[PDB]
Amino acid sequence: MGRVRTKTVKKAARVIIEKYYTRLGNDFHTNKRVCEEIAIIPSKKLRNKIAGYVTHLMKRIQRGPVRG
Amino acid sequence: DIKLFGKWSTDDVQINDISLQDYIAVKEKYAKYLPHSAGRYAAKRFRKAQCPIVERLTNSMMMHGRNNGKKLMTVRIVKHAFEIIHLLTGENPLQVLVNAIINSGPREDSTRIGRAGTVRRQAVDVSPLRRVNQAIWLLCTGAREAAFRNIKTIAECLADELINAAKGSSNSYAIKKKDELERVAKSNR
Amino acid sequence: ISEASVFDAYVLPKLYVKLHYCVSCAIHSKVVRNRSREARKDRTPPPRFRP
Amino acid sequence: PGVTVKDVNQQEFVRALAAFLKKSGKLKVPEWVDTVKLAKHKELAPYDENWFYTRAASTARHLYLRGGAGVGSMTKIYGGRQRNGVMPSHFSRGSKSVARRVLQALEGLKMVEKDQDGGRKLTPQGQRDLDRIAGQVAAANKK
Amino acid sequence: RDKLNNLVLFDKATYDKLCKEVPNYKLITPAVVSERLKIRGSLARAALQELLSKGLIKLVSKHRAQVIYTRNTKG
Amino acid sequence: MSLVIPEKFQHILRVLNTNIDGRRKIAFAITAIKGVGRRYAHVVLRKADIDLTKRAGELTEDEVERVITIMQNPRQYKIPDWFLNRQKDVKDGKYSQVLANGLDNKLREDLERLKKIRAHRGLRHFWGLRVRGQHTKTTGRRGRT
Amino acid sequence: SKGPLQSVQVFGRKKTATAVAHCKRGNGLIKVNGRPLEMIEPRTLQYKLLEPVLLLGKERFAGVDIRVRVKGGGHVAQIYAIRQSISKALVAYYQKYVDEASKKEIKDILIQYDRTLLVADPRRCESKKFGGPGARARYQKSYR
Amino acid sequence: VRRACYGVLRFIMESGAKGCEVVVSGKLRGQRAKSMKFVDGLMIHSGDPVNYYVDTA
Amino acid sequence: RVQPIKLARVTKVLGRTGSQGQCTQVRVEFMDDTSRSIIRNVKGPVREGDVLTLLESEREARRL
RNA sequence: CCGAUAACGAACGAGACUCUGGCAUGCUAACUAGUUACGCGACCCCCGAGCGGUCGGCGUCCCCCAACUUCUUAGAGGGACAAGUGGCGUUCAGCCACCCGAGAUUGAGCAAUAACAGGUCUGUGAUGCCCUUAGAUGUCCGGGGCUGCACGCGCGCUACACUGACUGGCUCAGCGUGUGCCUACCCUACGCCGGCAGGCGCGGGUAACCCGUUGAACCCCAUUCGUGAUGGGGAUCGGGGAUUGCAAUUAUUCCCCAUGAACGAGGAAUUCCCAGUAAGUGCGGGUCAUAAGCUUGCGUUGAUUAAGUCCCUGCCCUUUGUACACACCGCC
Ligand SMILES: [Mg+2]
Ligand SMILES: [Mg+2]
Ligand SMILES: [Mg+2]
């Protein structure tokens, strides 16, 4: 257990979805690469934690509307 | 063909009760040359089920402080005990081992705290995993205390404990303990 | 009781006892509990939780 | 199929060498072998009468495996557990005199000589005798 | 369960007993044969290797702690 | 030869003023005599040239009396000087090894030696206390109550 | 028949016990520290030493020449470092020099028997803490 | 104490800092001791960033 | 006269009970006649689908 | 965290973060780490094995006289995110199972608002006040004491044994220390003498260069013992011999030979603990002129049970009551 995302990773993931939607896609690794330059993240762990939740969100929004 | 200890093929042994069929691990998938591996079988729940039963016995036998890390020593004890039982009976050492496990597992128990304010000993029925746990523990403890203060060695006392539990003749410590658990269960069903 | 009953179909009876409590025995026996200031104004009986 | 000592069982090889040294009655044996203990951490003298022959066999084998060993290195190999009575156990070395007498007896047997640095290694003759015994003990173990 | 005072050396009634009935049951170990013949157990090991050298028993394991023998096969 | 008992067997055998069981091995039987431990038992048997694989009752009378005169006479039989109980004796300076109740009366004599001169160990022994300086604060309760 | 430069060097470790296996073209023989596998130190676990050749078959080991150098850990750890490095060496040798169609059909046998043959055990140790004898045990405390 | 501590907090914030915090502890004009804490702005306490983001005296 | 020892397969783990979690209630079905499914509280590690031995049939298990 | 929602947007703490472990046959490299190949050797070989086998034997930065980083070291990078699949879930947060994968929960360090009249004035040239200050409560020197024993309690060490003890053989580590401002005290290889603790010469190391391939214990394999307070146990005590120290008695420590006491698994009770964990087992650091049954770390062997609950014991939150607010150690 214990995989709940902090508001830090969650809000950052939402924000980059807001501004950069076309630049991002369904692939985790591609999303983590675009996360390198559309935003600065001093932690690699935060980088792929944010990217992981981005792919989870974009998968959900591909077939419906969310709070983003 | 797997040649446990270099002999004692595991393709001829069978488990009579379906309750314990998918919890003993003697079949060809779980058949290994030695009961010694770094299998990490306690990493998570329901992983020890696919651990080999001979490895389970040689793990639950190192007990009581002075011998808790001596797994090579316990394996050599299983070697000699398996040699003795095969010599004494003539059947497969795994067949008698599985036979003793089934007959020593207590099929029913009591929760003992069914009424917390005043004890009631509410009856309860056990799981198959609890069956193999209690049977292995009972047999290992019976072999432990049988050869504690006499000339007979651990390997020999484990050998006679296995055969006595295999048949059931009121002289195996595991059999007596299981019958006691069933007896108290019947008293307070 | 039903197994030992000589009748092929018997209905076990019911005890109908009406109990009267002072508020101290009611609270001690946990029949009634303290409630919030707003919760005290609700007079509906508590749900039975029958299903 | 040539045979080296690393290709045979070490215990049977050692006892085969001790038998070899026992029948070749030339190795010098100090007079106090019947009385002393093999190490400080020991409680009883060794059961075998010819413990000196066995220890000389083990010493020759050990120098073959790793040359350049001295008396101090020997006592580490023949060191062991000291029970210390009621205090918890520790580790203790072996008898230095026993190691010296073995190494000098091997020296007189012309199978151990001094090194260019400190310590003692085998002579080619001692290496030859080790491999010849290893071959014959491989034959015995097999058939 | 008070004491055992096991025999340290064989006598007429026990030495003939091992030569006549010990190599008749399957399990032959120093521990079992010592408690069967009420002998000490160093007697058990020494006489049991004498039975090995005679050829009346067979050796299967030969471990430093638990050494196991057996009766010779009949057929 | 793991055969019947030899007819010259003594299950109880008398040495000095103490009986030693003939059933056990010689080295671990004669240790029942006061003043000889396992290390001293093994060296005297090794110099006596007797096979240790047999029991104490197996020894014939000449072998028994030989290990007798061996142990009371260690110095003359080349036993090393450091195996003795009474090395550098305090009343005559003679290096000796004591094997009987002579040890009891010689330990008794040394006890009263310190006791008469009122040395600290003599006083401590008289009072029944520990003498080697170990703490008596919490240990030794069994010997007093 | 006289071709050089066909050799691999694949290690395998368990509990700070590293064993490096050097595999080469030659007649079938496996040696650890210059000694045969059958003449191993803990003879009771020698079956663990010689089981990888039992499953794979001596024909596959007939065209190889393995020498292993070991240091670190204890007896059991060195044993597992041996069997892991031996099973790794020839399967990497097959990958390097023959088709991997043969590699896949020997690798699935190795993993189905014991995955530790080709995958190292990650567990090493745990540091001791300043309140108890070991990593997690704590010193006995009293209240009265 | 209030006059001095508020004066130095204003100076630190004027010079430019995310946060600051002064604690004056001890006894003044009486036996019983007391601690006064004057804080403002952001202040972190935990982790590695404290080493290179917090100056302490 | 005595009900014979038979076997029942776990269908679904209901949840822990017994005021300490030492036992878990679970619904079981009987392989002899699958139509009969009753609730029994069991001790030990239990999954879904594993079959357990029963020394009796009628007694359903209530709480504790 | 998600959702309901007079809240919306935040901040501290949690998390994040630093260190550590686990994978990189990918990168940069290493005569203070090596490995393969080759050249001489030493031996077994000869049935002949011959690109045969072993070698911690010597060499190929003895710089012209091989290559390379797999093993080792340490830097930069990568790598794991609930990523993919299936199921459950308001189908949200997330949870379970499986695949591939080194790893699908590695351990610590740091750690809020505040409180505890918690501990420390015997850590300090931190410190207020009080005491003492020449027959000193300053300071030095000598001796003693801090160890003293009808008893009670706490942390522990060793054991009660054959799953063992003894004897011998075989055989594997990693942390990590090492010659000094004052400061006097280092780690020790090798040879010689003794049985030992030890002594004497010859060196090396201010250190991946030497100890040291740290040849550790446990364990493994053979011998004896044989259920007996026994070859378990080694308390108590006598005699002797060394080492450090100016000084060893009230034994500093160690060594040898003697005696051989309780202890036959422990009542009421009670402690610690979830995977390289407990436990068995040794080894370094601190303490140190001499010193570990302590502590702090490290390595070796290596488990049983559990993936839950509020029953016991506590703790937190909400509601509630209050004549308390120095806050129940209250008020009265
Ligand atoms: Mg944190
Ligand atoms: Mg003594
Ligand atoms: Mg009111």
UniProtKB/Swiss-Prot annotation, chain A:
It comes from the Eukaryota. The modification N6-succinyllysine is found at residue 19. Keywords: Cytoplasm, Diamond-Blackfan anemia, Isopeptide bond, Nucleus, Phosphoprotein, Ribonucleoprotein, Ribosomal protein, Ubl conjugation. One of its GO terms (biological process) is ribosomal small subunit biogenesis. One of its GO terms (molecular function) is structural constituent of ribosome. GO terms for cellular component: cytoplasm; cytosol; cytosolic ribosome; cytosolic small ribosomal subunit; focal adhesion; membrane; nucleolus; nucleoplasm. Its main location: cytoplasm. It is found in: Cytoplasm; Nucleus, Nucleolus. It is linked to Diamond-Blackfan anemia 4: A form of Diamond-Blackfan anemia, a congenital non-regenerative hypoplastic anemia that usually presents early in infancy. Diamond-Blackfan anemia is characterized by a moderate to severe macrocytic anemia, erythroblastopenia, and an increased risk of developing leukemia. 30 to 40% of Diamond-Blackfan anemia patients present with short stature and congenital anomalies, the most frequent being craniofacial (Pierre-Robin syndrome and cleft palate), thumb and urogenital anomalies. Belongs to the eukaryotic ribosomal protein eS17 family. Component of the small ribosomal subunit. Part of the small subunit (SSU) processome, composed of more than 70 proteins and the RNA chaperone small nucleolar RNA (snoRNA) U3. This is Small ribosomal subunit protein eS17. It comes from Homo sapiens (Human). The lineage of its organism: Eukaryota, Metazoa, Chordata, Craniata, Vertebrata. The gene is RPS17. The chain holds residues 1 to 68 of 135 of the full protein.
From Swiss-Prot, chain B:
Keywords: Acetylation, Cytoplasm, Isopeptide bond, Nucleus, Phosphoprotein, Ribonucleoprotein, Ribosomal protein, Ubl conjugation. The modification Phosphoserine is found at residue 127. Component of the small ribosomal subunit. Part of the small subunit (SSU) processome, composed of more than 70 proteins and the RNA chaperone small nucleolar RNA (snoRNA) U3. GO terms for biological process: cytoplasmic translation; regulation of translational fidelity; ribosomal small subunit assembly; ribosomal small subunit biogenesis; translation; translational initiation. The keyword Repressor does not apply. Transmembrane segments: none annotated. PANTHER family: RIBOSOMAL PROTEIN S7 (PTHR11205). This is Small ribosomal subunit protein uS7. It comes from Homo sapiens (Human). InterPro entries: Ribosomal_uS7, Ribosomal_uS7_CS, Ribosomal_uS7_dom, Ribosomal_uS7_dom_sf, Ribosomal_uS7_euk/arc. Belongs to the universal ribosomal protein uS7 family. GO terms for molecular function: mRNA binding; RNA binding; rRNA binding; structural constituent of ribosome. The keyword DNA-binding does not apply. Gene3D superfamilies: Ribosomal protein S7 domain. GO terms for cellular component: cytoplasm; cytosol; cytosolic ribosome; cytosolic small ribosomal subunit; extracellular exosome; focal adhesion; membrane; nucleolus. It is found in: Cytoplasm; Nucleus, Nucleolus. The modification N6-acetyllysine is found at residue 32. There is a cross-link at residue 32 (Glycyl lysine isopeptide (Lys-Gly) (interchain with G-Cter in SUMO2)). SUPFAM superfamilies: Ribosomal protein S7.
UniProtKB/Swiss-Prot annotation, chain E:
The keyword Protein transport does not apply. One of its GO terms (biological process) is rRNA processing. One of its GO terms (molecular function) is structural constituent of ribosome. GO terms for cellular component: cytoplasm; cytosol; cytosolic ribosome; cytosolic small ribosomal subunit; extracellular exosome; nucleolus; nucleoplasm; nucleus. The modification N6-succinyllysine is found at residues 12, 54. Belongs to the eukaryotic ribosomal protein eS25 family. This is Small ribosomal subunit protein eS25. Component of the small ribosomal subunit. Keywords: Acetylation, Cytoplasm, Ribonucleoprotein, Ribosomal protein. It is found in: Cytoplasm. The keyword Ribonucleoprotein applies. It comes from the Eukaryota. The chain holds residues 41 to 115 of 125 of the full protein. The modification N6-acetyllysine is found at residues 3, 12, 20, 26, 54. Component of the small ribosomal subunit. The ribosome is a large ribonucleoprotein complex responsible for the synthesis of proteins in the cell.
Curated annotation (Swiss-Prot), chain H:
GO terms for biological process: apoptotic process; base-excision repair; cell division; cellular response to hydrogen peroxide; cellular response to reactive oxygen species; cellular response to tumor necrosis factor; chromosome segregation; cytoplasmic translation. Changing residue 35 to A: No effect on phosphorylation by PRKCD. Transmembrane segments: none annotated. It comes from the Eukaryota. The keyword DNA-binding applies. The modification N6-succinyllysine is found at residue 18. Its main location: cytoplasm. Component of the 40S small ribosomal subunit. Identified in a IGF2BP1-dependent mRNP granule complex containing untranslated mRNAs. Interacts with HNRPD. Interacts with PRMT1; the interaction methylates RPS3. Interacts with SUMO1; the interaction sumoylates RPS3. Interacts with UBC9. Interacts with CDK1; the interaction phosphorylates RPS3. Interacts with PRKCD; the interaction phosphorylates RPS3. Interacts with PKB/AKT; the interaction phosphorylates RPS3. Belongs to the universal ribosomal protein uS3 family. This is Small ribosomal subunit protein uS3. The lineage of its organism: Eukaryota, Metazoa, Chordata, Craniata, Vertebrata. The chain holds residues 115 to 171 of 243 of the full protein.
